[PDB]
Design a protein around this ligand. Sequence first.
Ligand SMILES: CCCCn1cc[n+](CC(O)(P(=O)(O)O)P(=O)(O)O)c1
Ligand SMILES: CCCCn1cc[n+](CC(O)(P(=O)(O)O)P(=O)(O)O)c1
Ligand SMILES: [Mg+2]
Ligand SMILES: [Mg+2]
Ligand SMILES: [Mg+2]
Ligand SMILES: [Mg+2]
Ligand SMILES: [Mg+2]
Ligand SMILES: [Mg+2]
Lengths: 346, 346
Amino acid sequence: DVYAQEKQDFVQHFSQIVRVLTEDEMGHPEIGDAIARLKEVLEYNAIGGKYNRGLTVVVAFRELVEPRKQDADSLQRAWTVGWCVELLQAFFLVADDIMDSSLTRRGQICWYQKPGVGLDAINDANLLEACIYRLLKLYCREQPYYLNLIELFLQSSYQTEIGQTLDLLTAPQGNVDLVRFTEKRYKSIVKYKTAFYSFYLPIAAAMYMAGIDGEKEHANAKKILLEMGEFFQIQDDYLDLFGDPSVTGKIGTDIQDNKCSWLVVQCLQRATPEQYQILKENYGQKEAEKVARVKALYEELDLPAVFLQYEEDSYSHIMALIEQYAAPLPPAVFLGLARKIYKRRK
Amino acid sequence: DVYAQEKQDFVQHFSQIVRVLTEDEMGHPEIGDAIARLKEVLEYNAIGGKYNRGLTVVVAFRELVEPRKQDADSLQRAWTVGWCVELLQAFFLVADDIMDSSLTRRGQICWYQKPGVGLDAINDANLLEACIYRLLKLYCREQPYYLNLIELFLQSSYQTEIGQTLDLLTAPQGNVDLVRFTEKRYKSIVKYKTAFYSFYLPIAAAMYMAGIDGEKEHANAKKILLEMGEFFQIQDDYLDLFGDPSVTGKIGTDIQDNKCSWLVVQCLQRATPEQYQILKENYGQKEAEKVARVKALYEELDLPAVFLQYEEDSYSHIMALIEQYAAPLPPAVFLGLARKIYKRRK
Ligand SMILES: CCCCn1cc[n+](CC(O)(P(=O)(O)O)P(=O)(O)O)c1
Ligand SMILES: CCCCn1cc[n+](CC(O)(P(=O)(O)O)P(=O)(O)O)c1
Ligand SMILES: [Mg+2]
Ligand SMILES: [Mg+2]
Ligand SMILES: [Mg+2]
Ligand SMILES: [Mg+2]
Ligand SMILES: [Mg+2]
Ligand SMILES: [Mg+2]
């Protein structure tokens, strides 16, 4: 309910993001064509998702700032910082779709796969990242949390690029080595690639906006949010193979891209050495027959049932973590976000 | 002479950049393999160039800071900010080589063209950009110019991505339209894509480090440096076709990539309508015969002689600009940089 009620206002206020990013550079008409390319990149790549991450900034801002201090202006700042998280997301996905050789995202063909786009998408992704800091400057330059916000977005992008390097190093194409797909490797990838920017970044932006900047409170929040990010990435892995791509909005590639998925880790931990070899022969290869052979091994080992058991235990554990670590922040902030990701099918 | 004397110290101190970026994240051993990938990216992509841009930071810092304030520590900061400019450069070139489909850079194959690299180079480029802000934090966090430095590197990357969009929009592959290659378009591309980061960025970093942060002094410096950047990019265009690739360290692609080069603008301005059509039929295409036909048109129109005339007039003009705008900064700062780029063959 809390996410669903703020949605509308948050989405409507994307026109303004687009205007402020296009308008404040028409005192420079020579870049006009670039500005129009920017708008086209924003509209195709920041729109059409669920907005969980940016909505989180706005929800937690209401819940943490005293209503006497929710003036029209500090609200406007809140949904801008929210949009900055949506722009970080857009930047990582556009690049990620190239590196993953993916086909669709959010119901449409991937940006790079569009006629006349291709690898120009690389500079388009870098421009989306640039917008974040332009926004921060335009809306938040005179706020006492300004430098905290800048350092947070930069630190969060470095961690996520470190996690991406791990994702890629662990998945060399044409190079099946099942030995490297362990639980410890897995947890490291997902912590870096997904957990800091999807879960720590947004609540923490909102903390810094409410004046809550203590080390110890940031660490306690981080303890909850990183375990949630781990679950959330294990969920994304499961949906790559078994979700319905008209719900997820994307076709799966993990088996073909030779990925250290949660599924292949769970597989490897249960496999007869005969099953092992079937995995070995069929994994990380573009042939549909061969992907279907892996999928069939996974179903033979009840990996869907194991995913549903893990979802429940992970959820009880996250809840225990909230009871331990939420104070002095209102638990509603952690609970509202957990509700939105619990048993998602997209 | 001034560049040549600081070189050694500047280069030697790259081991330290590499150590500080690898060491201060081994309290996190799970990212070990990513850290090693980072070192490999740094060594292949920040090393082997002339270091003009980073050396500029260090040279202008000596020339602008009072020697009583050139303590061992503020010097160390100076050659770090220098290296941050070399890392911005490395980030743009790695991406640019993909978008340009280039073959070599600085005497070796392009990063993305290395066996086992490919499009993973996209995340490698984004990591190189991340390092800049990690450095700024590690060395400069408590300096009064810290936030000026952060905003400068970010603003300079946005401008250069705007210029890249223009570079790419003006060069759609498979789409010969000679109508868009004008002088005004050209000047706009080069101002954004090259001039702010190669020329304004480094002197200005050094200004902010010496306490010189006035609007008006920054604008005056900018007036000189942007015209120098324009010349410098016109030079790079000329070398793409007529430089010797054992000096430049790179094979040219401008004709094949359908580029708004200086050469094609000068061509279009002198061409008989018969010459025009030869250009039209042969431009922006991968066939060697067809590139050689364009090259031969260019030589038939004395474009090499016109380049040498422009080099001289541009140089006299830059010098006039220094006489007008250099004060209260020592002219040595502008003169030393102009000497290093005047009649370069790489
Ligand atoms: C650069 C940012 C790295 C984090 N990142 C990127 C994409 N995803 C989710 C994916 O699950 P991934 O390719 O599987 O990790 P997707 O299913 O493609 O959306 C997370
Ligand atoms: C993203 C940064 C845009 C600025 N940029 C990139 C490369 N160069 C110089 C080149 O001249 P370009 O491809 O010709 O413009 P190169 O000969 O390839 O080194 C400038
Ligand atoms: Mg992906
Ligand atoms: Mg991925
Ligand atoms: Mg996925
Ligand atoms: Mg290039
Ligand atoms: Mg280029
Ligand atoms: Mg060039």
